Amino acid sequence: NRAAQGDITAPGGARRLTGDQTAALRDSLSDKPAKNIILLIGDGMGDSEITAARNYAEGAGGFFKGIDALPLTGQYTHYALNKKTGKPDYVTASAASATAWSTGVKTYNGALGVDIHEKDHPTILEMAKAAGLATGNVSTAELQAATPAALVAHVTSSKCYGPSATSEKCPGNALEKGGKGSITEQLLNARADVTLGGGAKTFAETATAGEWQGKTLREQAQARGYQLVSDAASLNSVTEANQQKPLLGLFADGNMPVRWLGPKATYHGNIDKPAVTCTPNPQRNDSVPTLAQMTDKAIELLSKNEKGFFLQVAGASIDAQDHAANPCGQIGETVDLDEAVQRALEFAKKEGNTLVIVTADHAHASQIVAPDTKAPGLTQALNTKDGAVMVMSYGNSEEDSQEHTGSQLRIAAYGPHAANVVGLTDQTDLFYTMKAALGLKWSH
Amino acid sequence: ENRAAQGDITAPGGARRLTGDQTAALRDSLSDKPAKNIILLIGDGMGDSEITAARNYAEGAGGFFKGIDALPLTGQYTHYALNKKTGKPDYVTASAASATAWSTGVKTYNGALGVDIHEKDHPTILEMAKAAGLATGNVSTAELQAATPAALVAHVTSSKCYGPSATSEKCPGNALEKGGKGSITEQLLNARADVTLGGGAKTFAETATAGEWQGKTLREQAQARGYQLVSDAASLNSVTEANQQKPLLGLFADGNMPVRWLGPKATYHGNIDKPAVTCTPNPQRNDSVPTLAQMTDKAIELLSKNEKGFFLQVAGASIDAQDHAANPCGQIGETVDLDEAVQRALEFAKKEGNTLVIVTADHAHASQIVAPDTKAPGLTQALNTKDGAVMVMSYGNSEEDSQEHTGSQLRIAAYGPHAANVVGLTDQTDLFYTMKAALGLKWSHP
Ligand SMILES: [Zn+2]
Ligand SMILES: [Zn+2]
Ligand SMILES: [Zn+2]
Ligand SMILES: [Zn+2]
Ligand SMILES: [Zn+2]
Ligand SMILES: [Zn+2]
Ligand SMILES: [Zn+2]
Hints:
Subcellular location (chain A): Periplasm
Oligomer: homodimer
Bound molecules: zinc ion
Binding site for Mg(2+) (chain A): 43, 145, 147, 314
GO cellular component, one term (chain A): outer membrane-bounded periplasmic space
Protein name (chain A): Alkaline phosphatase
Binding site for Zn(2+) 2 (chain A): 43, 361-362
């Protein structure tokens, strides 16, 4: 536990440490191999997003029982490359960054599972599947979006969701042109044991060529022996997920609804509008499973594999709400991810050979600023758990979308080989850290 | 020891900063043994964004700070202050409340220096190290009366109480002539650190209204209390002792010492409407003005002579000043200036073996690294980095002439004995207790 000791106004009352950490940190360090890996990604969850969400939901002296409970921490760099020059591009897109940790190769903004030469590389999910391990891919967003897709697809443009967009924007990857296919076609080919998220609308599209030509991708999946679940009741009813009966969960047309509702940040919002208190999103049906609910069922099904498993969990709507300059939606998705991190650690502590990693693909726009601030961008005053006002600001874009930032950010880990996230590392080091931990070998 | 990119950042594994497994090396970095010395280096407003922007510019994205990034044990720490009336958190701290938190282990309100929300003074880590017979050093690139060096030697209810003039008016409770301990400078001279180096010479021109050295300038008071006064690099070098008999006071500027790099101020649509900038040495900085590393190196040399040990604090204060000024070049230049000082500290620590070196910031700041094409509402600028690529920096949290601090948790890094105590999530106040325990210091207030 790293919460404040007691009276934050008294000497020592704000301390998060109870004593010396040397002995406990020594015991946290293991050279032994990981049987399983649980990688949790908060999309755009920079140190600012963690602090804003803790300050709001848990109080400044508060503590995330998930996100902040990982003992070994560091900062890692996530710059992408300029496709023409091969030089760094200091602000990565979600796809170039997801490619970096899933393949250990940097790439250009737009690329998914391919380097700057458009050459595809095997992913940590593919290599784990090759070694006989169970594979899980869970996201709160569309399964075709950057984070879940980087594990199962190789396309020259991250916009190549289905056959329609692929033929037009990735002619080289289009199935009817000799290519591996759209992100969804490649996802179905990849055959992860557990795939849960949104992006049901692309499964409505039909294949232009191949073995399941003229049938919807939804129909292709059914014909290929997949289990299709669309709500929390049916997801719960699943008892097995393997290579014979793989599980595909489609819980939204696009992105699954955000858990918290609040207004969008506005120009002088902290001055001109009242302090906001986040409310549960009423449009969200209770039948839509949460990230922790999906994480928990994935963990359950994947741990039946005696050789081990690799699971990736993506709190993708953190980024979406940061883009939308919506502090409530953004904080809500950080809280949603914290619940999933808690499930992962609960499991890891009990199992003993599970490496849990919690990080982000890049930093984002949101900043915590003084309540009195007169900023040129979009702002909002929020009423936190402390009973004090916090002002959040979005001042890096005049367009309707707030943008990613290139700041290095927190990488945290628990379990075997977790020492490899401490100090300064690169997003690509994460790939090799995972590969080594599971004792995987290059395969495609 | 090195965390630069392996080779070809475009090739698989070429961008890796790791050469192998880090478990064994991190096990060896962990020491339960006590620290003979501590070197605390503070980059004022040096959030993770400031570290990245500087590295990207000066060393390349796959680059590495031989100082700042060479500390093996790392974590994130929280630096919120308190609202004086409610005692509730104030999510964005000023420099003085944050400096008070790590130097006393007590949170305080924005304005306070060395005092809690009740205006009650608490002993500082410098005071306790001095009480146990250790040598004490306080080095900064800005005014010695400013937040970071001041939090170690003064207790005032307003950080603006530099000299007797401002104190009588804004801190009547602390004013010497009203029974108080005095202005920041009066308290600094009383604190008698063995080594004090920085700016803020103009306040030493003021005379005391009351006390033992009434009617004499604070500069004359220092001389009368056996201090050594140095004002340039040549004189700093000429110093040989620095103890309680002959303490050293270095005043290298009237106010803040000039920044090392010159670049234009960020402007509205600067990345679009103005050419990419390349930072140039500041022509207003004389070579006679000592650098942070030069001051750090002489302080380490003089304090080392103490057989019982020493406590040294080093403040790269102008990082904040240039972030406030939305000047990417000045800001990056001062992060580079601090990296040189961190290098001196580690060079020393690695050789000595019992020195705990800590590198952190008092709070985060405004600057953000954004896409080159960005159309931002605030102030922006395009910069030509070591990579031969353009980096755009943005300042979008203030319409006023000063960019503001941010409340994001930030990096804390450490090397040496008890360095494990910065790993994971901690509080700025945990740093005080980490340093107290490492040196085996006991609560004392002379
Ligand atoms: Zn992203
Ligand atoms: Zn593949
Ligand atoms: Zn995004
Ligand atoms: Zn500051
Ligand atoms: Zn005192
Ligand atoms: Zn020297
Ligand atoms: Zn400041």
